[PDB]
Amino acid sequence: PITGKVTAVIGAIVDVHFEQSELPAILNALEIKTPQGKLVLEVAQHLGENTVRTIAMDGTEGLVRGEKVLDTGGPISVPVGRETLGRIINVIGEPIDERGPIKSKLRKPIHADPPSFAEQSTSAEILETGIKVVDLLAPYARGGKIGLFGGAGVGKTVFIQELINNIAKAHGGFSVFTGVGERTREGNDLYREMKETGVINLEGESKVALVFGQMNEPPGARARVALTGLTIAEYFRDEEGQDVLLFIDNIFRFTQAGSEVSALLGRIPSAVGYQPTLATDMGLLQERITTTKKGSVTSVQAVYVPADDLTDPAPATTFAHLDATTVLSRGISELGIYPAVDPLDSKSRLLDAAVVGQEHYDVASKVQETLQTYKSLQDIIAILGMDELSEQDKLTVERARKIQRFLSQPFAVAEVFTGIPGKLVRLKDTVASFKAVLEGKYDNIPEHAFYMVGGIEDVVAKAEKLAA
């Protein structure tokens, strides 16, 4: 056997001395018997002569040196199946929703390798979203990273609730929402709402699976929660060919967590207080988001600022890998736009013309252009007077204000919030609707008739009713 007694506890960095000629491998999971259960510590270096140096994942309240250790022989393995959907699971894969033990099918290590060069996104293609705004100005792809911007309460919670609904309708797909630096008090509030709104049902099958980052637990476990979720998504992807959505909260706490563990391992943190392994830690996580031969994960990550700037090492490295931005703004949410997306900072580089179609590109560029001309003229027009308008100008004022209102689409999930039963609007209906406003066939139609409506079909009704 490979067993060894604990011989140090500097920090939460536990050095365990093993029997002569037998020692673990790096990235192994060690199990330590205690009056607290177990501590699952993950080996990150050998010191040699059958000694190791590990990191902690479960908290450390004090440890008697002379405790027995058991080497499992490989990395910590988290459950997979449709028996884990709708249950909050910690880093080692155990319930923290307190509905007590949960069933499982297979267990699979949280470290897996990027898929082959055969099983890649060799072609960008469009993943349809229930939100018309998304589908125009930054349409979603398959094996894509789409980086959400802004904080929490900025329109954040509703954007996330909608997506979980869309995917399921769209294919029959699932989600796993991971939160890193999720506050334990707030996560309860969210879980209670998610249950009410039908994105967590209490059957064995649900939509979204929840994986949460407990800040009262070590830094190693903040960093590894991300990989715990990635693994459940990947099973669905590999063996049932389901398309999934893996959400992250703070990618800020991913970086903070990861640095603390380097610092603890002695690897020099210089270059703006960030770890040297920054590029590769990302590279591993994000190359496991790809299209294979059956399934394709697709990912919404959230960027949250690290010292009131974006020039710092952690944003830049996140950004490089990105392919779209969706830019939720609190100001825009206060004006009662759902989605809260800022329609001039929503961008995609998969908005080419042979990926998205030649037509979809034309509609979308005019939409940007119309609002861009509108906002700039309005600056000095407001002040000087709105009787200083030209014939050219007031066609633009007309088109822009009517488009802006039209952006507000209730969602089924935010039915309570917005006040209207939700809509879902798909790739055909985004082009057709926004196209018509451009040819000004719906400029004889009030603005209270573009409020809380979806694509072209829906808005026919409103024009009649306003008058009635």
Partner: protein, 499 residues
């Protein structure tokens, strides 16, 4: 059954000889296996592990030999044998790597065929002598109206490609790849530049897409994708341009050239940085290695135009840096600026303002390399560079007089600025640059309005390619601007302004 044939391979290998020197892994950690032993070993020699993880001898110490693991710490553990492989890093070279998507061992990650190759050459090789070179006088055309005017590049010279992230940094280059569709296709060997493209530190999806981009434009078969992936360790993100270069040295020394497309040298510097701070190599200037200077120059000084004392090729060396949000007075791009002559920058301004190529002339300093320009283009690109130096100075007037400054090279300015905007994935041959540009130079786009620029340019190109096909031929194949143009090609231009 596939298994019998595979099982059978493993059986042939079963009977192994004496290990030349046997290290033992004392400990492992920092990605640096601390391998005891290997008493007599060459410095930085490649090694393999009996695990099947290869590394090489990065630290050489009196009683110990640190190995940089290329492979993982998962599969390495203490005790394990570390077999002398005996070679210092060498690379498979010559053709057979064409159509191939490859890594730093020069082995395929497309998975198409085996790499077969005619011989191997060292990955560290040093620069050619002073006299075994000659100056450049041979045009890198790139297929760009704009960039071939401002600074076309010498065949053999390093010139910094810089400019911001995704500003058409990945995009604009496929134009150059498609330019070899004119030249590398053709039997003449001083027009062969094999398309030694690289992907240091780019994600698997991006790389995956990139291959089929080159298959779609069908330049792929004469190109290479000397890739590296941001998921896996520093030695790949280190050895990949050197690998690429050795490929280029083979062609280069045979009289064929390599078009060597060094993307992304910023990843390499980051890998370098990272490996310093991993292995406790002390944080230099701005916490970036001390020797990242020596790393970029060691690679880029390889580049020359050879005379005829070593062959006739060249290493057409394109040091692509991709800047993270500007900051060009950082240590990595200041060093690179000095190591290179002139420069090329594309802008987060212009590109997202909807003018692409996004170039600014100031941040693209003309120096040595526009002497390699062929006459016809040079005659009107010289004029252009002045007129745009004016457009700049004339734009920057607010600290109108209605004169030669404030209207004329405002107009001629705006006009040529719009003319130059190019939708990508198009080669433009050398006779489809100058007659257009020439028209702005005589101010025959001054009648033309900011719409009509391409209606002009395109209807002019059609009217040219019906009645002046011979003149187009003389412009690209004499490479000259001749008296017969200064008549009929100018007469063409003048006739076409109205009609």
């Amino acid at each position: 059954e596939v298994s019998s044939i595979l099982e059978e391979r493993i059986k042939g290998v079963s009977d192994e000889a004496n290990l030349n020197e046997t290290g033992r892994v004392l400990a492992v950690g920092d990605g640096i296996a601390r391998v005891f032993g290997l008493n007599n070993i060459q410095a930085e020699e490649l090694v393999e592990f009996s695990s099947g993880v290869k590394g090489m001898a990065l630290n050489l110490e009196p009683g110990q030999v640190g190995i940089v693991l290329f492979g993982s710490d998962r599969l390495v553990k203490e005790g394990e044998l570390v077999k002398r492989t005996g070679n210092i890093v060498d690379v498979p070279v010559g053709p057979g790597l064409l159509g191939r998507v490859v890594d730093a061992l020069g082995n395929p990650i497309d998975g198409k065929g085996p790499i077969d190759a005619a011989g191997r050459s060292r990955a560290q090789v040093k620069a050619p002598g002073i006299l075994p070179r000659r100056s450049v006088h041979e045009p890198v055309q790139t297929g760009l109206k704009a960039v071939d005017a401002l600074v076309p590049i010498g065949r053999g010279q390093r010139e910094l490609i810089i400019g911001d992230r995704q500003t058409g940094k990945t995009a604009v280059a496929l134009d150059t790849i498609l330019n070899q569709k004119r030249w590398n296709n053709g039997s003449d060997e001083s027009k062969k530049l094999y398309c030694v493209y690289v992907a240091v530190g780019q994600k698997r999806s991006t790389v995956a897409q990139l291959v089929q981009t080159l298959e779609q434009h069908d330049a792929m078969k004469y190109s290479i994708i000397v890739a590296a992936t941001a998921s896996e360790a520093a030695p790949l993100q280190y050895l990949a341009p050197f690998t690429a270069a050795s490929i280029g040295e083979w062609f280069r020394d045979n009289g064929k050239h390599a078009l060597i497309v060094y993307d992304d040298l910023s990843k390499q510097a980051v890998a370098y940085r990272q490996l310093s701070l991993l292995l406790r190599r002390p944080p230099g200037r701005e916490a970036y290695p001390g020797d990242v200077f020596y790393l970029h120059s060691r690679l880029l000084e390889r580049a020359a135009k050879l005379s005829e004392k070593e062959g006739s090729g060249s290493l057409t060396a394109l040091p692509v840096i991709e800047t993270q949000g500007g900051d060009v007075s950082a240590y990595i791009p200041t060093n690179v600026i000095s190591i290179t002559d002139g420069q090329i920058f594309l802008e987060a301004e212009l590109f997202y303002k909807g003018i692409r190529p996004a170039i600014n002339v100031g941040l693209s300093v003309s120096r040595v390399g526009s002497a390699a320009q062929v006459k016809a283009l040079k005659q009107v690109a010289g004029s252009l560079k002045l007129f745009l130096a004016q457009y700049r100075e004339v734009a920057a007037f607010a600290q109108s007089d209605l004169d030669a400054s404030t209207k004329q090279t405002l107009v001629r300015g705006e006009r040529l600025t719009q003319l130059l905007k190019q939708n990508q994935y198009s080669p433009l041959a050398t006779e489809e640059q100058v007659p257009l540009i020439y028209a702005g130079v005589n101010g025959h786009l001054d009648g033309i309005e900011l719409s009509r620029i391409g209606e002009f340019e395109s209807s002019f190109l059609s009217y040219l390619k019906s009645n002046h096909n011979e003149l187009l031929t003389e412009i690209r194949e004499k490479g000259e601007l001749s008296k017969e143009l200064l008549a009929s090609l100018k007469s063409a231009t003048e006739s076409f302004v109205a009609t």
